Structures are given as structure tokens and as C-alpha cells.
Curated annotation (Swiss-Prot), chain A:
This is Peptidoglycan DL-endopeptidase CwlO. The chain holds residues 340 to 473 of 473 of the full protein. Keywords: Cell wall, Cell wall biogenesis/degradation, Hydrolase, Protease, Secreted, Signal, Thiol protease. Residues 1-132 form the NlpC/P60 domain. The C-terminal part of CwlO shows a cell wall hydrolytic DL-endopeptidase activity. It is found in: Secreted; Secreted, Cell wall. Belongs to the peptidase C40 family. The gene is cwlO. Identified in the extracellular proteome as a number of processing products of about 50 and 30 kDa. One of its GO terms (biological process) is cell wall organization. It comes from Bacillus subtilis (strain 168). The active site is at 38 (nucleophile), 92 (proton acceptor), 104. Disruption phenotype: Disruption of the cwlO gene affects neither the vegetative cell growth rate, cell morphology, motility, sporulation frequency nor the germination frequency. The N-terminal part of CwlO was shown to have no cell wall-binding activity.
Curated annotation (Swiss-Prot), chain B:
The gene is yoeB. Keywords: Signal. This is Uncharacterized protein YoeB. Induction: Negatively regulated by the two-component system YycFG. InterPro entries: Endopep_inhib, TA_system-associated_sf.
Length: 134, 155
């Protein structure tokens, strides 16, 4: 229930049950209701598994790109944070699951699993990856 | 007049989307040469940034949103997204979002007409090809205009 597998387990447990809360996931009420934005979702899943990615109120995509250790796309592993260019550079984040998929929270269907080779996400990905558990 | 067509409903929805995004972002991009105060503060265990000058006060934000959102929607939107006034300046918590819903290519199906309200269900295709999203939007006649009754109905 800890580390990479604990974060992925906890995060995956609300797939389909967690609509995106725009800019949210940091109040006690949002956390109670398990609704998040892309970065507060990642922070919550890892914090639930005992991994500190930053304070609740201050953690965003901007701060998560500074956490952990930079690794190359070619060496990316299950549990790494993958970043994507949406409306801005590194505007979206998810947790790589291995085998070409990633767990994330986005507005279309909330917490979900998407494919790295989905044409949209493939184009959005510029190789920015952060390893947060060694 | 007493009606709102599919075509008109989508145009209003797109305006609501732009106003919601710009207000959460702190700036209307079409106001040029606005100044944006830098610096952050903590309040209610959240990290805040300041609105840019074009939305720099609550009054400026209310006037920006009045054409497209009802009075109740504006008040509840400030509360729901934890806007605050600090040192006379409007401020919004930090956070993230995305624009995967391709609202401009959506279709609108009428669901309800009750009193002075009309509800449409939009089927919104996505930028990443995930299943098209269902989104209900309720429009209320206020001050002779059809206005969206939820600040966050169109994201």
C-alpha cells in the first residue's frame, strides 16, 4: 500500500468515479470528495502511499516538474511522472504505468487511464519525465 | 425571444467557456497592456496569485461576467473556486486545467423548458478522441438576456 504500487493502486481506485475539479483538489472538502485537478490528483495518490511530492496547497504542474530526478523518455519506468504540453509547456501530468499507458485526471472523463501512443498525447509529450521513487 | 435555439445556445456556451477560463487564469487576453502583480500569499491553507489589472478587483470581475452568467452563478462561482480579496486586490488559488473538450464542434439537444429556464445537453467531441462528453447547461433569462446559471458549466 506504499510507494509506486500503492500510489497507482490508490489512484486507480477512483477511475470513472472522480470528475475533474478545475484548479482544485487542495481543499479538505475536495480531498474528502476525491476530486482533483491533474497535479493535485498525482500529489494525492503518491501522498496516500507515503511519498511526499510537496505541500497540499502549493503543489501544481509547475512545482511537480521540479520534484524527483529527471530521466529520459527512453528509460521511463512505471511510477514516473510524465508531463505533456496542452495549453502551455508541461501543462498536464500523469503517472506512467509501464507498457505504454498512464494514469491521469483530465477534464473529459476525470480520473482515467490513457495511452502514450494516442496521437494527441503522443504529440503533446516532449520527453519531460520525473522519477519520484528510486 | 422567449426561445433559445441550438445555434444560440452553443454561442452562449462558448462565451461562458471563455469567461470562466479567463477569470480562473486571471486575465482576459484581449485586454492589452494590463499589468499583473507578481507574488503569492497563503490563505485558508491554499496558495494564491493575484488577478491581472483588467480583473484586479471583485467589481471588475463581476462586470466582466455579468453579460453571460446569472447573478447567482457569479456569486456561487466566486465561492466554489475560493476567490478572495487581499490588500484590495482580487486573487485566485493556483492550480491546473486542460481544454480537451472541443466545445466549438459540439451539438446541442434540448432537454427541458421550465419557467424562464432552458436546459440543453451538449455532446462535446474531445481533442484526444476519448468518448464524446455529455454536458448539461441551463440558461436563465436575466435582464432580457439568456445567461448560464453555473460559472463552471462549460469547461
Amino acid at each position: 500500500s506504499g510507494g509506486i504500487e500503492g500510489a497507482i493502486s490508490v489512484g486507480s481506485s477512483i477511475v470513472g468515479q472522480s470528475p475533474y475539479k478545475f484548479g482544485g483538489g487542495r481543499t479538505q472538502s475536495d480531498i474528502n470528495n476525491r476530486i482533483f485537478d491533474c497535479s493535485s490528483f498525482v500529489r494525492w495518490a503518491y501522498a496516500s502511499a507515503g511519498v511526499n511530492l510537496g505541500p497540499v496547497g502549493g503543489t501544481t504542474t509547475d512545482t511537480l516538474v521540479g520534484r524527483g530526478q529527471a530521466v529520459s523518455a527512453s528509460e521511463m519506468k512505471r511510477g514516473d511522472l510524465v508531463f505533456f504540453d496542452t495549453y502551455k509547456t508541461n501543462g498536464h501530468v500523469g503517472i506512467y504505468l509501464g507498457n505504454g499507458t498512464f494514469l491521469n485526471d483530465n477534464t473529459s472523463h476525470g480520473v482515467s487511464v490513457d495511452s502514450m501512443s494516442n496521437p494527441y498525447w503522443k504529440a503533446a509529450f516532449k520527453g519531460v519525465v520525473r522519477r519520484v521513487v528510486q | 425571444s422567449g426561445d433559445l435555439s441550438q445555434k444560440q445556445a452553443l454561442q452562449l456556451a462558448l462565451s461562458a467557456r471563455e469567461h470562466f477560463w479567463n477569470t480562473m487564469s486571471g486575465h482576459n487576453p484581449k485586454v492589452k497592456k494590463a499589468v499583473c502583480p507578481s507574488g503569492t500569499f497563503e490563505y485558508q491553507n491554499l496558495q494564491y496569485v493575484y488577478m491581472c489589472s483588467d480583473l484586479g478587483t471583485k467589481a471588475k470581475a463581476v462586470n466582466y461576467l455579468t453579460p453571460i452568467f446569472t447573478k447567482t452563478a457569479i456569486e456561487k462561482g466566486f465561492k466554489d473556486y475560493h476567490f478572495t480579496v487581499s490588500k484590495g486586490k482580487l486573487a485566485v488559488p493556483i492550480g491546473d486545467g486542460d481544454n480537451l473538450l472541443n466545445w466549438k464542434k459540439s451539438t446541442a439537444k434540448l432537454i427541458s423548458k421550465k419557467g424562464s429556464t432552458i436546459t440543453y445537453e451538449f455532446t462535446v467531441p474531445t481533442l484526444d478522441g476519448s468518448p464524446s462528453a455529455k454536458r448539461k447547461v441551463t440558461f436563465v433569462k436575466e435582464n432580457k438576456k439568456w445567461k448560464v446559471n453555473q460559472f463552471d458549466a462549460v469547461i
